[PDB]
């Protein structure tokens, strides 16, 4: 049912990079309602709602999970619980290596899967093509340079 | 399907105590084929079978999970992934406190549930009654004293 | 009986923010005879009445309670007694984090329920939508900007 | 329904005095299945049950609450929520000043009700007479001296 | 011809506020191919083109003009030349008082036409309604409370 | 006549352990007036009474005797005279090996009769069954796990 | 009458090996109430009973006697009187060489009868088959390997 | 074509353990013309033949590989080349941890596939059942005990 | 005649940036023969050839001249002479601000012509489009994301 | 199927020299979509693909393989597995001795096949001629001098 959503599994200590990533996803043309990002007031959890039950519903109905791996991802319990919850159900997933992560991919995640980096223009081009293939969208060159500049200046 | 099995989540650094615990169950009348303790040659994963897929089959089919909580259950990625896998599926659960766990319950595990201790005679009596109610068995007092003595000497 | 009334639980040291909040509630179109705010001469306890008997009569009848959670709310015996009363009675409840509060939600109040903030414009929009849905009201954009500006000026 | 049961409200930092008090309660002739002392393995919450739901049901049903007033009863949130819970429901109550407490009775508890001390023999005689009258029991003098000696030895 | 293209007359020392204003114009839904903001690489003069003939053609063709007046708009020969060209050609005009400008509207621009302030929620609401009516657009409140927050954060 | 009484022969140097033993009986359901223990103020000899005539009369009438055998029972004259009186009168008797005794059962006591240990849980279960069958009593497990814990902690 | 009961003749010094052998007998499926192992509390002599009269009655009624021949068996009187009592009555008997016994069989037990050593897998298989034939039981291979490993670990 | 053979990858420094393992395989009923153990004159490379072309043909045509993993297995280049050759060809394979190998699996062989240890009787029972199911053979319990004794003597 | 040939006018103290620029031009698909960059052994002046006459033969016949403007370009005597030689003949021209040039354009170069900066992705996109328009070439994205990366890594 | 592709086996510690060699391969005329160099983002494994199955398919389909033999090529397990895969599959092979390697050619690759050096002009000429004959290309000396200088500078 919810296969079209994008559950961005992350840590709260990676706020800025994940914010920039979500903003780029919006810029390419992803509807702002399809990103279940629980660290932004505009995609977070509705008020007067159960947090964990709200997450469980989305994970159970099937959501494209995004592991934004980093050191803090493996230092937080809830992130590993989410990894297990998406492993057992066999939800569509994808790994994203945040800058500065030189560690080992532990846990029950598929360790023999190629991860997406976010460090050089070719990486961003590959990610853009991935998203456009996923949601069947279209983007033009001038816009792509503008978005790339925005993302790069956000990280800096 | 596999609602009558027991999945003893644990850390391999707590091999001794858990061992005794599982043995206790077999004394009360739990068939040795129900426990899926994966740190004993007689209950572990059969040879030439994928480990993680084998565990996932049982967790997905609805094994009655036991959380053998301790300072090591929160310092192992696979145990937290197991916690997450049981959380999102709504598997029947039950907490257990290993001796010396003077700490806080974290993660998505129900923090307001009542845990079972394994220190005093009343604790073991309550656990025995729990298991007897679960599997619909009967026991005699003399057997119970023998089993309790065995368990206590094993822990020491 | 008193299901449609609002019992604004608060600490007397947060008078200004609660005054602005209740004034905004009235502005949106909530009749001033429903709000029960015992730090204002116009909603407080009538004269020649028993304070605690009046408050208990209102709570026991099912007043929709709002928790003005802040640092002074958890340093006031009477406020915690109101929290316990509404907890046991199972009254409809809603949490509101006053500006500047970054603590932990202790007590028997549901800790996994999402709280309403009062900092960004989106929080006030969500609060306005909640109130309009609750009381079946309507509002116009111009009035909304005027009310928001009034609230911001009051807090400033 | 639960008028006869005794709900011993207390703080977890007053375990020794409350243990002596509850043991004396049992000695006088009160069956241990009525006391709902929560810091005792033989009176606490059954395993696999919700803590707060259990306590809330017991209070809502009309348990005869006892206040163990001390310097820690007014430095513990949950105790004050219990106070408010028993205040709003109008449950039968009774104050008990633990030894060493010389403070002021705050909160919504009746401040003009006479409290029970636990220091001198006349206080224990009055408490014993209260319990015997409440539960319609009988006692003999020799047993009373033995119980008093046991209590005083426990406190020392 | 170029009647639907916004020409943004401004000084080069007020580039931050004009950048925020143009970004808001784009957010409401104004195509980036219309705004002519010669202090931005994505809206400025194409390379290998005459700087002044380009603006001369754009003004002569009838571009809607926005006067971003401030203390620098009256200290720049080129800005006053654009004002004169707009006055002589009788192009559609709209005034805009940048924050901090509390002076007289000199020159040949209509001193009786009402200006558009940008320093309060009602002003931004009026500007948004003006633009939506101008280009026959549509906007939703949930997006508006985010766009306004973006603008305020930029100006702050 | 006094067959229903119990005469606990012992040595004062074993005051502690013997004490606990007597209390255990009192918990099982033994009337406190049927235990003639001459080292506790509540069972000892009355005042203004001959110390030795009391014991002589009680032994003559046929009190059941429990030999608390230890290294001090064989280093105290009076204990040996009590053993001789029991032997000559042929009163019902039972041996009890206190923790620590590893010597030989000397004297005129029947050396072939099996003793009663008080070390392991099975020994306490056998003692409980003996007392229950002797005095025609009844007990419940939930209270036995508490009585045994009391005994063990007192001896500890 | 008691021909279905086992009587394990042995010396108290050879305790560990006999304990392991009795446990092996119990796991094979022999009721724990048939083995008469006086060095174990769970099969020993009931309290307040004549030791020698009890053993004499059990041997007179009839019982298989397993001679745990060893060096200490021929250095203890009571073992030799047990052997003589078995011989005179024509009780069914079996021999069981304990590890390390490289001496000569003496006394009145048939010196030509074949004994049951226990120091290799084949001996344990033969013993298991003998016991199964005796009591008409059934065993499975996996359980047999588990029991063999347990016994070997205990002897080690 | 040669899928019924058993290619036994190993290192020449593990001659004794692999010799015992191959002898056990033959004893269970595996024809000596199937095993291709290189370090034995009765299963080695026939004379006047290319050393490597023979193994190349056997691996290419299909052969059940037996990774006899150990420390010396990861210091021999040829062993790693055989590992790669069987990996790319998709050859049926199994893993066997030799005694004393405390390391971790590396290379391109499934690290999540369960292996067959050879330490305890249950491991040998599992291996025996595996082989019997593989080649559709039969065995007798006494024969199995003799074979296990021989293997243990060889390994000792 | 030589209108196709490019004539990169520069200063020898801007060697690195001009080298990177020429390499980018070559990568896009400009024949290495066309560029008349004189600071490279591969495009410079042949041997045994007059320098100034060789440059004049190209400037006179017509050649797209690129002005790599910088502080050093206005600090040399030959660069200004090339500027005048291309001004008098009216050869096709193009300006290029090398990074760090914050000065004012002087001389007889058209000072109202928009110049190509090289700092940000949009500038390089515009340059690429200009060159593709010039020489009628085609370039794919995956190649551009690599050529651009080469350029920035060289300039860094 | 993949006879016209190049697979470049190497260690990850010799990435600089292999990068220079691959750049030279592209310079000579080899299309960039034929070199499979997994240490470069532009030739590596596409994202969201199995790392090992991709190389397995490429090798199984018959990719021309170059062995970047060196000291680090014999300390890597994966390289020795690719060597075995090529040996068993009989893929076309070519050796390349990286600078500084003065050891023995072990493994299962032809030790009597002459290798290719990369340290003197004649070696690079031979490599260039080999590649040109392989792919049926053409090159000019004026370009060859620049390519050789580039390679030498890169290695320097």
UniProtKB/Swiss-Prot annotation, chains A, B, C, D, E, F, G, H, I, J:
Specify the superkingdom: Bacteria
Q: What is its EC number?
A: 3.2.2.6
For this protein, what reaction is catalysed? NAD(+) + H2O = ADP-D-ribose + nicotinamide + H(+)
Which GO molecular function, any one, fits this protein according to its record?
A: NAD+ nucleosidase activity, cyclic ADP-ribose generating
Keyword Hydrolase assigned? yes
Q: Which residues form the active site?
A: 82
> Which of UniProt's keywords are assigned here?
Hydrolase, NAD
Give the TIR domain ranges: 2-151
Q: Which GO terms describe its biological process?
A: signal transduction
- The first-level EC class reads hydrolase
Entry note about domains: The TIR domain mediates NAD(+) hydrolase (NADase) activity. Self-association of TIR domains is required for NADase activity.
Record's protein name? Uncharacterized protein YddK
Species source reads: Bacillus subtilis (strain 168)
């Amino acid at each position: 049912e919810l296969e079209k959503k994008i559950f961005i599994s992350h840590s709260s200590k990676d706020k800025i990079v994940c914010n920039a990533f979500v903003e780029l996803l919006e810029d390419i043309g992803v509807s702002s309602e399809d990103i279940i990002y629980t660290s932004s007031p505009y995609h977070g959890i509705p008020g007067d709602e159960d947090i964990f039950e709200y997450l469980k519903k989305h994970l159970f109905k099937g959501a494209y999970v995004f592991y934004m791996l980093s050191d803090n991802y493996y230092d937080s319990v809830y992130c590993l619980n989410e990894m297990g919850a998406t492993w057992v159900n066999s939800n569509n997933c994808s790994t994203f290596i945040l800058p500065g992560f030189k560690g080992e991919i532990k846990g029950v995640i598929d360790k023999n899967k190629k991860a997406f980096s976010l460090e050089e223009p070719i990486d961003l081009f590959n990610l853009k093509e991935k998203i456009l293939r996923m949601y069947d969208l279209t983007l033009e060159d001038k816009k792509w340079e503008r978005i790339k500049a925005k993302f790069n200046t956000k990280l800096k």
